[PDB]
């Protein structure tokens, strides 16, 4: 209702209205075509499904959380959980694409027999069930329900707590920073960096075994763009949560947190152009 | 005696052209303006026969209008069952490249020819067991671009070495040889009488051959490019030809000239295959721009468009009762239309 929140809602609506058509268009261009049913395109379909899920659901839920209608605690937890459920699936789909792109160059002769679309579907299903586990961990019982009930009893009322639904209060920072950020957000980032440096070393070796320099510079620029995009979109919000946990006396503005959140959702808009559009086949199918 | 004999040949050809224009009273469009038009026909896809991994080069239905043989580049000759999308047999092939396939009109033999210069005859009943190579017919020095069965006993085959041939199966020899083209003989069609068969060649000429005699009864030259595929009008008095110059032509046997030309200004792509329906009213022409055009075969108007494919269509078969039209493309999907 405030001006800063109004700016946040406007940017979130913009990111949703950009990210939904791109992902629908990626799923469309794969569906209509029969030549885009390889394993790597199954991975890009997995990311596009997670991505349209983000753009369709997480951004209305994010606006709902930030406005903050008063409601019961378990209702607010049920509303705030699919956010994590979908963002974790986005990160794991990114990781799966990077692992595939490593395997194509590491073992190029026998790649077709190793990575079949059945094994691709098994790996996508594994990534999704692990994203549901990581997302649904707060509902299993690790939240600030105990603290809210203690405060509710202290104020003297009885029953289920009716609280202004706000994401920092309902969910524990310890879960957000330790479990999520340490265990399931930072190793995908470091593992993608390691994998892409290894892929660049393999490509450099193969090419050396000015035109080569230009091609190498283009591949390096593409990899660095991918890694910078991922590490710019995800890391600010999690660093803010981490500094909020470690030093509670560290006072930060609200607009900083809002910028961090719409960068986190901005990744959902940026992913189709960076991933699907760079393939020549996908541009052919798009133009025709 | 070359120059005066060539002058004689040119004078005789001029006389033939003069006779053809003498018997040409008026155009067909003027007299067929009085026909109720067709309008617009779109067809619903009913099956999608997905069992091939490479490009499907040719198909041929059966007389049951139930079974169809498809032949693909990956070395598979599959007898699809169009009703319940089944696979009755799948035959592995010696040569991966197979540019034609045929199904015997009783449903007891399957013939396929490729670039290996060898027609192959596979029997289907085979009380000993599975399907076996029964007879191999090899007498050509060109690719066998099309072959058809007369009956269960003798097969007429076109080729790429400028010769059609008639083969007996029980012996393995050319019962007769049909010579007198200039270029590669891309396709032949049989009349339902099984006595006369056309054949379209790469010298822009379609020639009609008698089976018993062995001679060109009639010769039609009206195209600007090579003739890809050819198919009789169902009664046996006419045949349509498709060429790479984006024209379909309908040639009449009695009047001995071309009747009509199907050519549209938006089309600059070649015809890969033609066919007729049961009544002879629709001329189905596959193209290179990834879709099929259904032409009104009397009023020369495009009745419809069948655009269910992703790559160009290489074969187009029609059942003998006119139920369903199966178009087979290079993306390995036989789309059956109704």
């Amino acid at each position: 209702i405030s001006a800063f929140q109004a700016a946040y809602i406007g940017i979130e609506v913009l990111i949703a209205l950009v990210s939904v058509p791109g992902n629908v268009l990626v799923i469309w261009a794969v569906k209509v075509n029969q030549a885009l049913r390889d394993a790597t395109f199954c991975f890009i379909v997995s990311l596009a499904v997670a991505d349209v899920a983000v753009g369709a659901l997480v951004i209305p839920l994010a606006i709902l959380i930030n406005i903050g209608p008063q409601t019961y605690f378990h209702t607010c937890l049920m509303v705030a959980c699919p956010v994590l459920i979908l963002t974790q699936s986005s990160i794991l789909a990114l990781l799966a694409i990077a692992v595939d792109r490593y395997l194509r160059v590491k073992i190029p002769l026998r790649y077709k027999m190793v990575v079949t679309p059945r094994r691709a579907a098994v790996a996508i299903a594994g990534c999704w069930i692990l994203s549901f586990v990581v997302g649904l961990t707060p509902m299993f019982g690790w939240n600030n329900l105990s603290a809210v009930e203690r405060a509710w009893a202290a104020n003297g009322s009885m029953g289920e707590p009716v609280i202004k639904c706000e994401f920092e209060k309902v969910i524990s920072m310890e879960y957000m920073v330790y479990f999520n950020f340490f265990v399931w957000v930072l190793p995908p980032l470091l593992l993608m960096v390691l994998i892409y440096l290894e892929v660049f070393y393999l490509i450099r070796k193969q090419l050396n075994k000015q035109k080569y320099y230009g091609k190498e510079l283009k591949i390096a620029k593409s990899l660095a763009l991918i890694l910078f995009l991922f590490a710019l979109s995800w890391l600010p919000l999690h660093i803010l949560n981490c500094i909020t946990l470690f030093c509670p006396s560290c006072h930060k503005p609200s607009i900083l947190t809002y910028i961090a959140i719409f960068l986190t959702h901005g990744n959902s808009a940026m992913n189709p152009i960076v991933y699907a559009f760079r393939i020549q086949k996908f541009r052919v199918t798009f133009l025709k | 005696e070359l120059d005066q004999l060539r002058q004689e040949a040119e004078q005789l050809k001029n006389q033939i052209r003069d006779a053809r224009k003498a018997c040409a009273d008026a155009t067909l469009s003027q007299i067929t303006n009085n026909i109720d038009p067709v309008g617009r026909i779109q067809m619903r896809t009913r099956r999608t026969l997905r069992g091939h991994l490479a490009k499907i080069y040719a198909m041929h239905w059966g007389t049951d209008s139930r079974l169809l043989v498809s032949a693909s580049q990956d070395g598979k000759l599959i007898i699809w069952d169009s009703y319940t999308t089944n696979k009755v047999h799948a035959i592995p092939l010696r040569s991966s490249w197979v540019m034609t396939c045929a199904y015997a009109p009783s449903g007891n033999y399957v013939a396929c020819g490729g670039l290996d210069n060898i027609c192959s005859i596979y029997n289907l009943k085979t009380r000993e067991g599975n399907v076996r190579v029964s007879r191999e017919l090899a007498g050509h020095t060109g690719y066998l671009s099309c072959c058809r069965f007369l009956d269960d006993n003798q097969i007429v085959t076109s080729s790429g070495d400028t010769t059609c041939a008639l083969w007996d199966i029980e012996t393995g020899q050319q019962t007769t040889t049909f010579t007198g083209h200039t270029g590669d003989v891309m396709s032949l069609s049989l009349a339902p009488d099984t006595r006369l068969f056309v054949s379209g060649a790469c010298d822009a000429s379609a020639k009609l051959w008698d089976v018993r005699e062995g001679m060109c009864r009639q010769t039609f030259t009206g195209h600007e490019s090579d003739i890809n595929a050819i198919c009789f009008f169902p009664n046996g008095n006419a045949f349509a030809t498709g060429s790479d110059d984006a024209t379909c032509r309908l040639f009449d046997l009695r009047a001995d000239q071309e009747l009509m030309t199907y050519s549209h200004d938006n089309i600059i792509c070649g015809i890969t295959s033609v066919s007729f329906s049961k009544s002879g009213r629709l001329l189905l022409a596959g193209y290179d721009d990834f879709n099929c055009n259904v032409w009104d075969a009397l009023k020369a108007d495009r009745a419809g468009v069948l655009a269910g494919h992703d790559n160009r269509v290489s074969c187009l078969g029609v059942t003998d009762d006119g139920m369903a039209v199966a178009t087979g493309s290079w993306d390995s999907f036989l789309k059956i239309w109704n």
Binding site: R101, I219, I279 | L53, Q73, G75, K76, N86, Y143, S145
Partner: protein, 209 residues
């Protein structure tokens, strides 16, 4: 009922397709073809099969086709590489055989079906060429030429002309090897060129290229 045999045939097609898809298909075009065939002959269309360093290669010789090339050529779309063999010693013999080979090379290069497919170029019979270059000059075929009679510059100029005939830039590569009579070197060059084509194909498929 019939669906049991339908699924059995589906399984057999899938297994046979997995077996066939791992193999590499190569298209030969010619003059020095027999040297290559007999060299790597370890195990209409003349088809030969050989297995080198955990790869299976099927090489297809189309030389026994007395027909129009434009008809059968689109069958061979989708091969990994086109082994195109040129005799170096054909600059003198006959119009000119070297110009005929360059015309065929230009035709396959600018052919619309082979925009993607890479050409492995074999310039064969280096010994007869190095004798005949001291014997006879290259004024016959090329007016724009400087290093009149020397093997190195002569071979490099022939190679430069062939690779210059390529109109498509960076879409496909031309790999040139002067044919060695040493064992395993020709097959090794074929293996390296095919490996390079497979890696470039995978990088293009990623979009990373």
């Amino acid at each position: 009922a019939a669906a049991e045999r339908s699924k059995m045939i589906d399984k057999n097609l899938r297994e046979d397709g997995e077996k066939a898809a791992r193999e590499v298909k190569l298209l030969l075009l010619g003059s020095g073809k027999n040297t290559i065939v007999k060299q790597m002959k370890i195990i209409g269309i003349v088809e030969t099969h050989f297995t080198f360093k955990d790869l299976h290669f099927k090489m297809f010789d189309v030389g026994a086709q007395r027909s129009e090339r434009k008809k059968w050529i689109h069958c061979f779309e989708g091969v990994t590489a086109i082994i195109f063999c040129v005799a170096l010693s054909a600059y003198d013999l006959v119009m000119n055989r070297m110009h005929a080979s360059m015309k065929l090379f230009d035709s396959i290069c600018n052919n619309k079906w082979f925009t993607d497919t890479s050409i492995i170029l074999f310039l064969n019979k280096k010994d007869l060429f190095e004798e005949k270059i001291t014997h006879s000059p290259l004024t016959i075929c090329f007016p724009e030429y400087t290093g009149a009679n020397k093997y190195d510059e002569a071979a490099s100029y022939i190679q430069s002309k062939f690779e210059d005939l390529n109109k498509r830039k960076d879409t496909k590569e031309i790999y040139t090897h002067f044919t060695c009579s040493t064992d395993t070197k020709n097959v090794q060059f074929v293996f390296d060129a095919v490996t390079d084509v497979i890696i470039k194909n995978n990088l293009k498929d990623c979009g990373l290229f």
